[model samples]
Target: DDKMNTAIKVIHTLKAAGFEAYIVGGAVRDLLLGKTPHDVDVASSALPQQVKVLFDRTVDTGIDHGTVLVLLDGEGIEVTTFRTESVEFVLSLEEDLRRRDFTINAMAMTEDLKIIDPFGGKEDLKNKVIRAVGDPDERFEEDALRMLRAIRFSGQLDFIIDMKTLLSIRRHARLIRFIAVERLKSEIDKIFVNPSMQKSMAYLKDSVLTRFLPVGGLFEVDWITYHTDGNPTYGWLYLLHQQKRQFTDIKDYRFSNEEKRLIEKSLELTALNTWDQWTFYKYTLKQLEMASRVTGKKKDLAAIKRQLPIQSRSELAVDGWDLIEWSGAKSGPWLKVWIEKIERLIVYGILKNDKELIKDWFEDEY
Candidate 1:
């Protein structure tokens, strides 16, 4: 009936088994902020085994860390056993909240929206401050990834890092080297793809965390205002353009080959001052929009799509086989060239995409 009612059912099930349960972490934070959380996580006194026993469809998602996934009503909710403050079998909601990274994310709520904020998480959330749960140094030393996560939260939530937390980050910034590059890349991806990325980038640059990443020198570059529609390619390509760096340089960040190709294509398209009909026919509307956004160029993408006869070679009424059969020419590189030329002619309105006319044009031209 509600957004997180399924997850609440998980909590109720745990409570029915004589265990304490509360919706915890980001879910509670977002709920308090009147925002719909992306996922609902539960903290419970029930052991992982107990949780698994309670749900018929349970996955031992992180059994070692006391987490089980319960599938109820087609929704998967994460239920984590309450971990002791000293990492022992003893469990307390306060202990679990203490171990969390930020005060803003350390709050918990019952199924009825009852808040259990052992820390001053609700107050910190009200102030828009991201303070670590306990000693920031200890937190970062325990998990260097949290340092990057702090910056990510700053971007995502538009919250300012508390002064003490900020200093601790600066002091322990070098500890980020112990974290895997892929993890760091993921956090950086979130930062760059955030609409408020500039705020997070400033914090990252100020804290000297950028020194450890492949994108170390870019903070000094003058960047144009950018949109954040969850397109990592556009985010990175915009940064590369700001730095006047080659697209190949993005390989240092370990982007997947497909992502690298997309970034490169976007960069190439963004470099153009105008959107030609051929460009419209070559790239999808999303790609063209991303390119134009990065370069501050406006394009009537709908108009171009409407005017172009064929958006792709497959949309053309003819094929390489048809061209080969008509031209009586052996298939080779020439076939590809012929198809491209015909596609371009159709796109440019110089010729119709009809098969008969295309065949006639091919015979006359060849």
Candidate 2:
């Protein structure tokens, strides 16, 4: 957290330099939208060299791209220099902002907190519609990942992608495949964990964006309307894990049975509320919390957190040697099986975290 204050202070220092600087990107967008910004980024008219000179803790994070990192307590806040596009570069800043995939995000702020609307982004934000800053085709052609970003922003902010932008996205939808799997995965995770995964489903369905994802089938209008009625919110990462594991047909990849169970529960809760106590127990607390976020249900989160016991097996008052010697078994699957069984019983509240209960489990199971 020392780094967090340092980051904020860096921005303050930049302001003190008489150079323009404001928290840019998602931080500004979220701030304007009245949401807490997870990461803060600052853009300034000050050149990169000047920024490094002015700040005590700094790194050349992306020097070629005019980006510098103000390292505060080992954490870095990205500070970028403001410059328009030049044709020779891999990406132009003006073109970069223009191709950012959503109008609401295209706006930037100066040191005095002045909102710059070079492409009518302020108007778009006021209208609650996401449109491409300039020519949609040019914007998307530069970076196809914008399509996914478009849907993600829509889902997260509960904003609509404008007709022109949505149309252009559909025309270039297949180009999204050119983006790396890692990038796609991040966007997918964000969509799933967002409060409006259901709304994202609608956007994806209407724009045919779902077909680009692994489990795009769930975006069918019928399913979306049904799930939207439940008004569930999902953790962005949890939902990504679910859609990737289940409905999207990406199951060939290795996933633990426990992971699959949690994913299934999350998807099921999105569509219906049919899982029982046994099924809920089948998941780890992390999975349960994710399920709650995806289903937009918060009631069980506090309960699950409250009921957890012994934190982990190492803290459960037993060791592998003790279990092996007591059960007359080797340190292999047999030992593991007994430990797992004991853990299940204890987790289910059928037994306490006591030596007597563990001994009983070992004796009876053996």
Candidate 3:
């Protein structure tokens, strides 16, 4: 919140520095939704260096390293880290809003908290609609990247693209091929913040479901997600499995390497109808739980995990010493073999874990 505080003051300085500054982009856009503004995109008539010059002391530090600019002289203003785009350049405020992709994103807030909605940006946001600013076709042409951003935005807010806007997107969908993968990923990174598990499924289906939902095909999305809070990574994995897409198929996206491995591991487990005791040891509870979840099956995963006698071999009731004393055996690969036997029997609830019983069984059986 201090970042937002600094952002307000930063805008104040820009205003006092003889420039017309207004809060724009997601900051202003989220105000209507009862969400805290993520990034304060304070657009101004002044350019970057000009704003830099206006601030008495300055340092251009890391946006790259997840840090921000600072003017630590006489009380610092340091919350520009993530979404405060103080250097964002704009022309006439009207022109900037008009050129923007969607109506919701086009609104701006003034220095005094008075919101200016030139094109029913507020009106459309209330209806949960994603409307293009001007002509839908023209907006797509202004920047084809906006097409993906439009779809991405719909998924993030669980909003619907107005019919006309979606139609135009379909027409200009080819233009998205020219858009950089980096930009595609940035919009997509935000897209997964959906409220419900698959509440935003239609857009996740790439806008094909909207038309089909009315016509009645596969909109029966009442399978999983169950209003329980789910991570975006889980949503991504769910999408992959539902679409019959595999990890290797979409190798070009922006998921992190660690994330990639986790998803891959889930994919490996997705085919199982159930889990075994060894399965827990082979993978993680989270990985197995995630795999089961994405399958849309409401299996009692935690309950099943608890029933296992030993999560790992170390939890086995008796050590090699008890086995060696019972069988009068030397320590060797054979010990590992017998331990494996005990582990499996204990896990299946077949062999009692009591050392006395184990000793009796080993002595009698051997």
Candidate 4:
């Protein structure tokens, strides 16, 4: 509550300086729903420069976009000058709220806890519906991200998009193409971890917004809802697993090479569906846990993982050169294959990992 009180102090300071200020946006909505807000934002009639002058410690976080971060007592608050359009700083709090993405987000609360709901935002919140401010098309045109944000919110709040707003999103689905890829991905990441993943996906599908995403028609047909455990990587893996076609990859577009490699490993490990030493030696427990938990694999993970004999390939009985010398075939692609085969034998308890035991087996096999 200290952080929230710090935010109110920001409004108090701005108000004492003879300017209008209010705790605004999602912060206000959360307060009304009886949930503690994680972040508090302030909207005001003061310019970002004027706000800087009033606060002892301030950073121009995004002053061009009419925002300044006022640091007070180890806490920070983002205070923005009101905006009626994209760039113009409008001096009206009500006008600023109008440009917001949804009714649940458009409501503002004064320093005295009085709500200024110009667009019946409170009613929409009470009804558990997400309604766009003004005309849905106008809001979407203002910033194409609003459409995707609508779906994200419905998932986060477990609310429904107003039918008019939903249809408008479906009509203007292609407009999301204008938004930046990172921004679009962030929303999808939130949806994946959310409890309402299916609800949000339905909105995404119904709005026909999937065609415009980096995923582009990935879930357009035969959409399957997979279990989520709040790990976004697991979420991505689940979706990728649903893509049966070898060529339909999200590798280059949405994921970085590092991320692609991670998901690919998990994808391979998930299909393996084994809880023995071979899987434990070949893959990490982290990957196995994620792949198993999300795919509903009921195998005893802790017991198997805790019982792993040979922790890694380095712990195996023989080396690549050891196999090559015993075979006298002199290191070709078989070296790689033979090393793992010996390691597997050691893990499966068919051969001891000791160099002498593996050396005896290697000569007999050759």
Ranked by TM-score, the better of candidates 3 and 4 is: 4
Clashing pairs in 3: none
- Model 2, 11-68: lDDT tens per residue? 7788788776666667657657776667777767678898988878777847878788
* CA lDDT scores, all candidates in order: 0.82, 0.65, 0.67, 0.82
> Compared with the true structure, what per-residue lDDT tens digits does model 4 show for residues 157-244?
9999999999999889999888888888788888888876887888888898987877667755433557676766766777667664
Give per-model TM-scores: 0.89, 0.65, 0.68, 0.86
Taking every candidate in turn, the Cα RMSD to the unseen true structure, in Å, is 2.7, 6.5, 6.4, 3.2
Per-prediction count of colliding residue pairs? 0, 10, 0, 0
Error of 4 at 276 (Å): 4.0
Off by over 4 Å in 1: 1-4, 84-90, 110-114
> Judged by TM-score, which candidate is best?
1
* Candidate 3 Cα errors over 4 Å, as ranges: 2-4, 56-91, 182-193, 196-200, 203-229, 243-245, 296-366
Order of candidates by TM-score, top first? 1, 4, 3, 2
Model 3: per-residue lDDT, tens digit, 1-366? 444566678778877978777777687778778887655666666655566677766665644322334463333443221122233333566766766788898887777888989989898999989999889999888777777677767767878878899888777766766666667656554555545325444553554423322211232334354332346566557656766667765555666897788888998899766667767656777788888777666777777777777677667779888877877778777887887777777888789877878777778777
Which pairs of residues collide in candidate 2? 193-235, 193-236, 214-248, 215-248, 232-295, 232-296, 233-293, 233-296, 234-293, 234-294
